[PDB]
Design a protein around this ligand. Sequence first.
Ligand SMILES: Nc1ncnc2c1ncn2[C@@H]1O[C@H](COP(=O)(O)OP(=O)(O)O)[C@@H](O)[C@H]1O
Ligand SMILES: Nc1ncnc2c1ncn2[C@@H]1O[C@H](COP(=O)(O)OP(=O)(O)O)[C@@H](O)[C@H]1O
Ligand SMILES: Nc1ncnc2c1ncn2[C@@H]1O[C@H](COP(=O)(O)OP(=O)(O)O)[C@@H](O)[C@H]1O
Ligand SMILES: [K+]
Ligand SMILES: [K+]
Ligand SMILES: [K+]
Ligand SMILES: [Mg+2]
Ligand SMILES: [Mg+2]
Ligand SMILES: [Mg+2]
Lengths: 513, 513, 513
Amino acid sequence: ENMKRYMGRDAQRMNILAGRIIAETVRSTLGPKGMDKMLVDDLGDVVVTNDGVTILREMSVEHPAAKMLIEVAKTQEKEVGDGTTTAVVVAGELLRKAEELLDQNVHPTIVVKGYQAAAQKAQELLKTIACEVGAQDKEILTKIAMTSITGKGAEKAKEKLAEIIVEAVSAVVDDEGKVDKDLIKIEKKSGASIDDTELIKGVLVDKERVSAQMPKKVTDAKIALLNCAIEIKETETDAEIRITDPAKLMEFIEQEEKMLKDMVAEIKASGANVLFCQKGIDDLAQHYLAKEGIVAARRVKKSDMEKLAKATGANVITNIKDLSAQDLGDAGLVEERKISGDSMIFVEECKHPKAVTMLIRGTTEHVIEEVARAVDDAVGVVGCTIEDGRIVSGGGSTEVELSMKLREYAEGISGREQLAVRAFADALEVIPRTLAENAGLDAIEILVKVRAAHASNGNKCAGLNVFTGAVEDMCENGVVEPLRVKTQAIQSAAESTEMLLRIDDVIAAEKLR
Amino acid sequence: ENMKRYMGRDAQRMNILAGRIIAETVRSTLGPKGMDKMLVDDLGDVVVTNDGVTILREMSVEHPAAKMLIEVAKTQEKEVGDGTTTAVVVAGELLRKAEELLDQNVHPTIVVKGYQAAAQKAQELLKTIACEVGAQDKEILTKIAMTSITGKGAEKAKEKLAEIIVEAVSAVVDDEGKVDKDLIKIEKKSGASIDDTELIKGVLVDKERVSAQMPKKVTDAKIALLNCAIEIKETETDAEIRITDPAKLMEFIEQEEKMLKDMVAEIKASGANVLFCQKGIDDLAQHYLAKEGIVAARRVKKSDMEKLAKATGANVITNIKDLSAQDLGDAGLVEERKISGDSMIFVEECKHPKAVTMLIRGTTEHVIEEVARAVDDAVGVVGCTIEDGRIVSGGGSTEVELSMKLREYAEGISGREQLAVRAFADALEVIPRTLAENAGLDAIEILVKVRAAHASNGNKCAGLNVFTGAVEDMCENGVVEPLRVKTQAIQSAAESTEMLLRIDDVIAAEKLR
Amino acid sequence: ENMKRYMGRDAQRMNILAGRIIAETVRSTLGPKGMDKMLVDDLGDVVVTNDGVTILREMSVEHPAAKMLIEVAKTQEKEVGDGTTTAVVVAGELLRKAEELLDQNVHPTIVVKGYQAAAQKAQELLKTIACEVGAQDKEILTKIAMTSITGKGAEKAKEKLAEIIVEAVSAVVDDEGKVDKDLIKIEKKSGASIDDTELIKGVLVDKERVSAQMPKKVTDAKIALLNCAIEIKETETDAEIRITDPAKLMEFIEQEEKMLKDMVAEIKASGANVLFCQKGIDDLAQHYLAKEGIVAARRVKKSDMEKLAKATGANVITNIKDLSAQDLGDAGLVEERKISGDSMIFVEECKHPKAVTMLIRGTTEHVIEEVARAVDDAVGVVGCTIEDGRIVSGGGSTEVELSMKLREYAEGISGREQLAVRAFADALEVIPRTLAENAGLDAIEILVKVRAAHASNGNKCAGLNVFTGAVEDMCENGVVEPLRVKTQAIQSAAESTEMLLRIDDVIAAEKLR
Ligand SMILES: Nc1ncnc2c1ncn2[C@@H]1O[C@H](COP(=O)(O)OP(=O)(O)O)[C@@H](O)[C@H]1O
Ligand SMILES: Nc1ncnc2c1ncn2[C@@H]1O[C@H](COP(=O)(O)OP(=O)(O)O)[C@@H](O)[C@H]1O
Ligand SMILES: Nc1ncnc2c1ncn2[C@@H]1O[C@H](COP(=O)(O)OP(=O)(O)O)[C@@H](O)[C@H]1O
Ligand SMILES: [K+]
Ligand SMILES: [K+]
Ligand SMILES: [K+]
Ligand SMILES: [Mg+2]
Ligand SMILES: [Mg+2]
Ligand SMILES: [Mg+2]
């Protein structure tokens, strides 16, 4: 270009263009025929993925409005877990549709007040076009999980990953019927092939036992968890022993030895035969533990302590004098193993696991760093279905329905907000358009057939099959999504587009915060 | 912005944007409420105008596609004379409409083949919606001239400039019924006010008479024009006179004096009493001319010689021996005057003037450098009406008619060129839109009323009154234009938009030409 | 200030401010109590003056709009001669009044269309409030001349300069009743005091006679003027004399001597005794001229030849063979003198002088370079009165009348141009305001009394006396001006303000012209 062209567009055109750029970046990642992006560091680190929020999070992005569009992905990441590409593409299409009305000289506030009236209507419509399913229905959960894994390169294992994830999530559904994601532990150990991934009803700990005389395999373990260290106590008032009789050198030392001997006696009297310590164990304590045949690990991290207490039913104890048979957990099998070159301790056959571990395998680290994402997304959508019990039809069959039902809305509205309501309704069809664009299909010929299927039936479901290249019922096909993925997406995108429509100036700030 | 955004748009988006910038530059100059631009040099020269092709000609413009849009104005300048802003605004609106179809993934060749089918249809329609008027009809010529001067700051004198220009142009209509613009001489002498502009049925010459004894006023002049110089001839073979007798110094010198004396005798015997020489006159020749009472000017420029020969009916003579009463022109009054600080020779009351001079007055040089443009445009449109005898209704009442009649066309066409035909028909309404935008009117409310006036009548004429802010018959109002202004505009704009639509790459050249 | 404030004003505010600056520069030079400016070069040259157009012409001025305001002074300089400060002050007050309406969001075209309607009304009013006087009336001419000299530092001699200038101008009134300024020669010879300035009914020539034997004083001179040089003619065909007999060396040389002897014989036979040559005279020709007692000067410049021919009635001759008693001028006294250190030839007591010389004296070159300006302005206003025969009352009594009579106009006009008409009428009172501001008077208290004097009488004349500090009849006081000074001023200022009101953009140009 040239210097003398900075004059030729408003600040709103500036911002709308800076925004459209971000949506144009991620759009080709969408749908089953989507493609991956390669991210490269200054230092030479490399990432390969088609996860949208990850691309938007790792990109070098410098314009303020583009920075404002990245926050549209993160909220979908945080509150739902899947859907971080639909949100940004719809947001940018809303920006670009708004650009088509400002060049006809429509006031920005009129556009904003129209979009506002359209989004609440889309909430009503989404709340009434959905299908209602029970949370105990594991089959549709499998189908939704598979729908989450499709298009991500790790497709070849989806019909196994689905079962694994459905059980994994069904375990951690709490006594109030809610899914917490951090109660599932995801571990990434290389070697073997992606189909060697498996589910552990228990924990994998990044530790090896302290003393090698300690039995390496235990059955029907009695597991004790400690937050206190097995070491000689100090006085928080400062001390000196002052040895005036030579005969009292060995006596002082023997009494320190006995103060550890009694701790080990007490650990034994509880009934334990496996031990975890969140803190240090002395090398003489280790001796008495290996002399009593108790298996012990030390300096275990707090999150692993939480997951052990969850899995076994043990209680973390802060003082050994209170430890009793009431505080001990149970687990059918404990064994140390060597896997992928690392020594690790395995806990298996737990009495009633409230936490579970998923072990992802793979021939390469760049493979596993993607399979982990493909599993996190499925945990998301499964939790959504279990919590809300409402599902919607996939393959963009929802956006066509919404566009039609908002156009039937727009004739009731009069004035000039009607223009913005129509531009909003016409911006949601970017998704089935792009779903055909990526597969190399003819989008303009496809979209008409898709619309026609709806207009003659009230068919909630009909949409594009990107393989046969034909228009099919997406519920009979088994392409299903949870309702929370649409509402959140539209909600985020509308609320973030209105801010860029309400701005008219850009000025400089003096060390803001 | 930022470096890492160069990737995000195609070469076609590049070119379309670089083009839209130019049309956005000149658009606010359009219509009666249009505003002027100030142009500033590197050296400090200044120009103030709202003439479009002048803005586009003097601008520092560096991108190739913007350079390609400037050629849309120059052709309208060259072939018609007026209309250089409608062309560029319509061109950029065509670019921007084309941009709305490429983001739906329509092939560029499909767009080009649609535009092509639309422009020929617009030619048919323009050839059939026009009004047919005779070239002798001076009243409508006045009305068209006034329409050409409206909106240019020099509005206060338009009802005098119209009469002046109509007579000036009617003089130079040749025996084959065609108007040549260079047969009208436009002169720019400061002082007095714009209303002191006047028309001379003759010539103003940038000369003063050679010898001050020569009469300064002559009535019923007999004017002689020479291409040869009145000087002593040289031999194109080289010469020496070789004086061997002292008594032959004065004799050689006297014979050179006689060789000028006889030329002046011969000029007198033709019957002349006023002289113009395209070349030198010797200081002794000047003596004999002032002794015979013949008025003479020397080194007159060739174009002034042409205009004198045209105005008086004299014949430019290359050799004085052939000069006769057959070669002399006639003019009722010749006088030298001092005007605006310059000495000039005035020729008036010509026997049958085939050329005329217009003397533009004004209080400032920046004023006159604009009044000259405002008169050149009216000479243009008057010539167009005199040559073609076809007129069209103004105030954008033509573009609405064309848009409607192309939409009635577009339902006959099937396939995907129909989309491009509609986008073409919807791009011509940029003109009545901008005509309301500049006057501070509400364009979206105005345009509907304007359309309605047409749809119920076949009213060719109805359009915006930018003063009352209301929709009126633009023929009863007297706002008229020549047909050649529309056809050429659309023709140029379509042909120049198709080139930017057919390009897909930009590469570097090795000293092209 | 700071970088981040360039945003905060429009291009029109830019231009209006850049314009107001120029009017603020020159405003304190206005009126009898006005003060002078000092101008300093890069090289060290110095000028001291309060002439406005000179300040505006010599200033380093770089912004385009300020460059556009300088053209308001030059036209008043060129077409009238006096009034170059009223024009610019009124122009800037019009700019600043326009600024007060744009901050209420009035459209620029509305302002321009109001100013236009006001200025034509001011022309009508000025054409009807003036007083009609005959051109033979030398008394009012004296009074106007004195009014032109007041306030310029050279006040002490005004009652002599007035008589000198009135006679000087009355001489050069041509047979058609028009005054040409270049027919008066202004000469600037230092020494003595400003009161030693005098008028010559003839010419002062920057020459001394060629041969010192030539009489230095001649009475009832017979003056011959030549455009040809008194030298041996050459052949424009090239020559060689070829001397084959030694006896023919002196013969060739004697014949060249005789060819000059005969020219001098012929000059004598015409009857001449004083000679001027616009070209060379040979050193032997000088001998024969000093032998015949004829006084001769050579290489006289063309303008001096014109003024001699005008003053004496002689005819400039191009060839000596035609010179006769018909071609000789007459003058009662010719003498060479030494004055101010320069030798000069004086021509006096001319038979019927159509040209006159004014000899300005003074103790310093910076004094005379100002007295010349103070005399040029009076020649201007005297010519204006002699040509038009219409006068107006001074001391700002005209601007108050115009403001009142335009306010009585503004109630007939309806719409929003009424606002601009009022702002125009209220902008003309800047002149009587500044006339009080410079004298250190209280302008707000003065202006009301001045208005009241008009409102109760139709008194055309009442205005400020800047000495007594009181309101008086300016015709009984003898402060009179020619009508052409007001009309031109208002006309220039309105036409130049409308251009800056019609602009809305500033862009860069590519070597304009
Ligand atoms: N078999 C299929 N045919 C067509 N579309 C599908 C199919 N399976 C999934 N999809 C669609 O792919 C989209 C998911 O793409 P994805 O890359 O996950 O985007 P996001 O990250 O925003 O969820 C959903 O809109 C879904 O309807
Ligand atoms: N009284 C009027 N009301 C509305 N439009 C007018 C009027 N007079 C002229 N026009 C319009 O102004 C336009 C001319 O604008 P102009 O600045 O000359 O553009 P161009 O240089 O392209 O001809 C024409 O389209 C004409 O119809
Ligand atoms: N005795 C006086 N009292 C008040 N005003 C006067 C008097 N004599 C002249 N003037 C005013 O001085 C003004 C001339 O000022 P001047 O510096 O010549 O400005 P300009 O160069 O624009 O003519 C005139 O408006 C005239 O009316
Ligand atoms: K994907
Ligand atoms: K215009
Ligand atoms: K002064
Ligand atoms: Mg997804
Ligand atoms: Mg035009
Ligand atoms: Mg003055």
